[PDB]
Amino acid sequence: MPVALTIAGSDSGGGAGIQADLKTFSALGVYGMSVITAVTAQVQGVHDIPPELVAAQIDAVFELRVDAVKTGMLSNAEIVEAVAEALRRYGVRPLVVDPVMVLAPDAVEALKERLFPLATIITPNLPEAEVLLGRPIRTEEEMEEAARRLLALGPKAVLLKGGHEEAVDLLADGEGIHGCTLSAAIAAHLARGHDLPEAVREAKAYLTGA
Amino acid sequence: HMMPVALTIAGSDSGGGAGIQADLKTFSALGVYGMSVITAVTAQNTLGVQGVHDIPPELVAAQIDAVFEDLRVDAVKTGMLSNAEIVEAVAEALRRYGVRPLVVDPVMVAKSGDPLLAPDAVEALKERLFPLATIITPNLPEAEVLLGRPIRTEEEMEEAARRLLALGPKAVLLKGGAVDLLADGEGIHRFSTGCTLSAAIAAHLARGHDLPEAVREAKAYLTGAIKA
Numbered sequence: 369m370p371v372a373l374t375i376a377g378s379d380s381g382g383g384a385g386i387q388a389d390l391k392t393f394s395a396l397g398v399y400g401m402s403v404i405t406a407v408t409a410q411v412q413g414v415h416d417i418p419p420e421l422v423a424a425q426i427d428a429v430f431e432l433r434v435d436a437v438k439t440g441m442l443s444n445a446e447i448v449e450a451v452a453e454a455l456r457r458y459g460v461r462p463l464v465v466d467p468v469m470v471l472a473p474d475a476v477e478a479l480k481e482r483l484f485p486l487a488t489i490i491t492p493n494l495p496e497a498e499v500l501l502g503r504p505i506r507t508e509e510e511m512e513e514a515a516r517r518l519l520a521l522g523p524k525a526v527l528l529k530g531g532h533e534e535a536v537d538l539l540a541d542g543e544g545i546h547g548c549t550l551s552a553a554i555a556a557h558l559a560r561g562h563d564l565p566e567a568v569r570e571a572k573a574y575l576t577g578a
Numbered sequence: 579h580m581m582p583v584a585l586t587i588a589g590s591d592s593g594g595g596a597g598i599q600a601d602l603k604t605f606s607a608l609g610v611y612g613m614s615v616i617t618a619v620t621a622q623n624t625l626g627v628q629g630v631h632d633i634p635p636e637l638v639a640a641q642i643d644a645v646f647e648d649l650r651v652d653a654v655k656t657g658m659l660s661n662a663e664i665v666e667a668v669a670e671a672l673r674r675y676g677v678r679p680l681v682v683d684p685v686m687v688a689k690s691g692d693p694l695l696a697p698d699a700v701e702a703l704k705e706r707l708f709p710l711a712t713i714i715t716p717n718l719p720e721a722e723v724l725l726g727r728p729i730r731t732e733e734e735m736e737e738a739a740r741r742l743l744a745l746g747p748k749a750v751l752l753k754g755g756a757v758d759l760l761a762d763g764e765g766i767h768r769f770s771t772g773c774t775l776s777a778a779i780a781a782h783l784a785r786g787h788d789l790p791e792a793v794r795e796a797k798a799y800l801t802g803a804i805k806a
């Protein structure tokens with residue numbers, strides 16, 4: 369019954385991609401949908417899909433009613449452009465933007481400018497956030513500041529994922545500051561009508577079982 | 579804990595009607611871990627095909643290489659191959675690795691009627707992939723294209739089944755338009771969408787079921803999915 373769309377790259381050998389997204393969707397009880405922006409070989413080569421087709425792929429997905437959208441690797445600035453308008457063209461939906469760098473600056477400036485305001489939640493991490501802010505994150509106070517300054521870009525929330533001394537994942541929300549395929553799992557709960565904090569908590573708890 | 583693994587080598591139908599997306603769903607529905615290689619990304623609307631972008635042949639092989647290095651594939655499916663260079667790359671890629679159950683669905687035309695296989699590529703499909711298939715699943719139009727003769731009666735279906743067997747495939751499943759024929763070197767059996775059935779066959783083969791049963795199971799799966 370729940371429907372969720374992933375708009376990302378394709379890695380045939382497992383790992384990040386529509387393949388990894390769609391497995392978590394049906395694993396969490398969500399009817400997964402997919403739109404391919406690029407094709408990857410696990411990295412021997414990368415092939416970008418033309419932006420007009422990337423947009424044309426999305427239109428075909430909405431008749432169906434999508435309950436949540438996941439956004440992985442958008443390799444071109446023009447793909448991000450076409451993606452953004454495509455999501456804007458249709459009705460408001462919980463949108464999860466996973467900013468995957470690997471990184472052309474031409475392209476990243478379109479994530480923040482064209483796509484982050486659309487997001488209901490972005491899930492970056494330590495090195496990836498540094499790309500978005502140009503500043504190195506060396507402290508949790510800096511990590512806390514980065515969650516704030518990121519949230520300022522438009523996303524109703526920000527899950528900053530910190531690997532490292534010891535570090536904790538931080539959820540930047542309006543109420544306050546509280547391998548990863550979490551984005552696919554977070555969007556899955558959102559399709560199920562869960563609110564943002566329980567979607568994040570149930571998603572993280574879902575991964576820790578493995 | 580490693581369960582059966584299957585691989586689809588088809589195109590992308592972002593709308594989810596056909597292509598690898600429908601293959602993956604029948605793979606997981608039948609309890610098989612699904613791998614996927616994209617040969618081209620297509621956008622299909624109710625009106626027709628809004629666009630096709632062929633993935634480079636050099637790439638498709640790399641995707642296949644990525645799949646078999648990671649895991650052991652228990653059965654393989656070829657769906658849409660759009661250009662002849664893909665067909666050769668896919669053929670050499672499957673040849674490069676061990677002898678598997680290979681289901682070759684010769685898709686040539688999308689639901690709307692627009693082409694999904696360049697005419698120059700179908701004969702490379704016959705020379706390169708058909709000798710590698712353990713079963714090919716053509717319907718009556720696709721056979722009429724593979725052979726040039728029209729199939730208008732059940733008698734002609736059995737000849738087409740025999741003619742197709744000569745191309746290399748161990749078995750041929752000819753789909754009527756009102757009986758289906760499973761043709762083997764040992765004989766013919768006549769039974770009383772296409773992407774789903776092909777993937778379902780490969781899925782049961784991926785679970786180690788013998789070829790005639792895998793077909794009867796696949797048809798039962800398809801019958802269940804359509805009616806209810």
Ligand SMILES: Cc1ncc(CO)c(N)n1
Nearest residue numbers: 589590596597658688689
């Ligand atoms: C990739 C693909 N395979 C099959 C069909 C339908 O035959 C389709 N429309 N697209």
